[PDB]
Amino acid sequence: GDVEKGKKIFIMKCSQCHTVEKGGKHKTGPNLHGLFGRKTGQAPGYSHTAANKNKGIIWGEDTLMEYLENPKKYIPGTKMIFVGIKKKEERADLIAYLKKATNE
């Protein structure tokens, strides 16, 4: 994925509710630093829904590809009110940016 394109997707569609930087603030949604390799719903200091807490999967490229295509289908009961990203290559670019920014 192209992380420069992914960053602009993140700004356009995600930054309204999320930060990615280490120690970044929670907003409507949790700060996302440390996302990869972590189980769902464990962002430190954020009050997740039980659904987000209980999904039980580990975030990685493949699980984020599925989640971000249709969030409420993957995690029924989520309070992330976002329709999803239809195009696979856009999701791949976003997730490549996420893998870089949430670990740097």
Annotated binding-site members for heme c: 14, 17-18, 80
What number of CA atoms fall less than 13 Å from residue 54's CA on the CB side? 6
Question: Applying CB under 6 A, does 33 fall inside the site for ligand HEC?
Answer: no
- Binding to ligand HEC in span 53-72, by CB under 6 A: 68
CB of 4 to ligand HEC, least distance (A): 16
> What's 79's DSSP letter?
S
Q: Contacting ligand HEC (CB under 6 A), which of 40, 92, 99, 102?
A: 40
Question: Applying CB under 6 A, does 20 fall inside the site for ligand HEC?
Answer: no
Hey, what's the torsion of the CAs at 91, 95, 97, 101, to 10 degrees? 150
The whole-angstrom separation of Cα 34 and Cα 57 is: 15
The two three-digit tokens of residue 30, written as one number: 């949790």
**Where do contacts with ligand HEC occur on this chain (CB under 6 A)?**
13-14, 16-18, 28-30, 32, 35, 40-43, 48-49, 51-52, 68, 78-82, 85, 94
